[PDB]
Amino acid sequence: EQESVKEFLAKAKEEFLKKWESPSQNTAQLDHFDRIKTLGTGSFGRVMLVKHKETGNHYAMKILDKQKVVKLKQIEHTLNEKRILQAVNFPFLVKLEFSFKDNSNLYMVMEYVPGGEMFSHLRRIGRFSEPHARFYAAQIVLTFEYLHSLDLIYRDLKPENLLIDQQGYIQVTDFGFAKRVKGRTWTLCGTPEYLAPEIILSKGYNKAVDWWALGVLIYEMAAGYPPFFADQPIQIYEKIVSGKVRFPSHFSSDLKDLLRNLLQVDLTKRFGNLKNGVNDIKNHKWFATTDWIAIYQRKVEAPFIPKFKGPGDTSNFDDYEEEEIRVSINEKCGKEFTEF
Amino acid sequence: TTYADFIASGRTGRRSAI
Numbered sequence: 361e362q363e364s365v366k367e368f369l370a371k372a373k374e375e376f377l378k379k380w381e382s383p384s385q386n387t388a389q390l391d392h393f394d395r396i397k398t399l400g401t402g403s404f405g406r407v408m409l410v411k412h413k414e415t416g417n418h419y420a421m422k423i424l425d426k427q428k429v430v431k432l433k434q435i436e437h438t439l440n441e442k443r444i445l446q447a448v449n450f451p452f453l454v455k456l457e458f459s460f461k462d463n464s465n466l467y468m469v470m471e472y473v474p475g476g477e478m479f480s481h482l483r484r485i486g487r488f489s490e491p492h493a494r495f496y497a498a499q500i501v502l503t504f505e506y507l508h509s510l511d512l513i514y515r516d517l518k519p520e521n522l523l524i525d526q527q528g529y530i531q532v533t534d535f536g537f538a539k540r541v542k543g544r545t546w547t548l549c550g551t552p553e554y555l556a557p558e559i560i561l562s563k564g565y566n567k568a569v570d571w572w573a574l575g576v577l578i579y580e581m582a583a584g585y586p587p588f589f590a591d592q593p594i595q596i597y598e599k600i601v602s603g604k605v606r607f608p609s610h611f612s613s614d615l616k617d618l619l620r621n622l623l624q625v626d627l628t629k630r631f632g633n634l635k636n637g638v639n640d641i642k643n644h645k646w647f648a649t650t651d652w653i654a655i656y657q658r659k660v661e662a663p664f665i666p667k668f669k670g671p672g673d674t675s676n677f678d679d680y681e682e683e684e685i686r687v688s689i690n691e692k693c694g695k696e697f698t699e700f
Numbered sequence: 701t702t703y704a705d706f707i708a709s710g711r712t713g714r715r716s717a718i
């Protein structure tokens with residue numbers, strides 16, 4: 361029912377805004393945790409598996425080096441990622457359990473999502489069948505519906521940021537580039553293959569960029585490679601803005617029609633950006649078999665359930681070089697990160 | 701093929717934000 365969604369999103373905004381205005385802080389400390397293994401990396405640092413000593417529960421702890429964050433001009437992005445993570449609440453968004461800081465680092469302790477990145481499963485299998493791709497895409501559609509209702513643009517959709525949980529469902533991680541923007545914004549950010557043309561062209565843009573990125577994701581899931589690629593980012597950008605795209609011969613007609621409407625250079629024609637908003641995507645023929653409520657309630661049988669031996673199993677993650685975690689005797693960058 | 705062209709791009713691994 362339309363009225364049910366409206367009431368849900370209104371209650372969701374009220375709760376989001378309460379936490380947005382009074383964020384939590386310093387809900388743990390470092391010696392409560394054993395460090396186990398690096399799980400992955402990004403533009404803001406490393407994420408490690410840790411074990412809570414008191415309980416034995418495992419977590420994924422994002423560690424940010426305050427001096428490095430300041431050197432790289434990431435103060436606002438880092439504070440904002442933590443503010444967002446402590447304020448949102450949605451089945452397909454990774455949950456923040458604790459956050460705290462010390463003399464050297466900021467720490468975001470997330471629920472550990474043990475099934476690995478979508479990225480690795482996709483590269484391993486090659487490509488996902490359309491039903492498999494559609495299962496994941498439906499979760500992203502609902503997640504963007506939620507985020508956009510809060511005026512949040514995500515801006516970094518890609519398989520690397522989509523973690524598979526024990527039920528086979530997605531958890532979106534890494535809000536380092538997300539922004540609360542009612543109108544338009546201008547920052548050049550994202551990952552080259554997934555950038556919408558209006559970003560590349562240095563236009564003011566809005567939440568429509570996430571819908572373009574959905575098109576890129578659906579294409580890459582179903583084809584095994586993204587729609588626009590090349591040796592160098594600049595060459596990727598020329599393809600993106602060209603308004604041309606080619607599809608594998610095994611793509612269904614319904615899939616191609618959806619992708620033509622998501623990978624639409626003209627903002628006045630892009631699905632998700634029209635007067636009917638997300639419903640143009642939800643009602644598209646390619647999603648005809650999708651039970652949106654059952655996806656949200658996680659009652660659909662997942663196409664793929666990852667293997668987990670037990671607490672702290674890391675088999676679904678690649679190995680990375682391990683470094684020490686140093687805490688300095690001197691407080692670094694205290695004023696900069698007061699609000700963390 | 702397009703797959704071959706993807707391999708030739710060298711961008712088949714994990715991708716960083718700009």
Ligand SMILES: O[C@@H]1[C@H](O)[C@H](O)CO[C@H]1O
Nearest residue numbers: 401402403714715716717
């Ligand atoms: O993960 C990759 C790199 O290996 C590094 O972690 C920075 O972000 C991405 O480019």
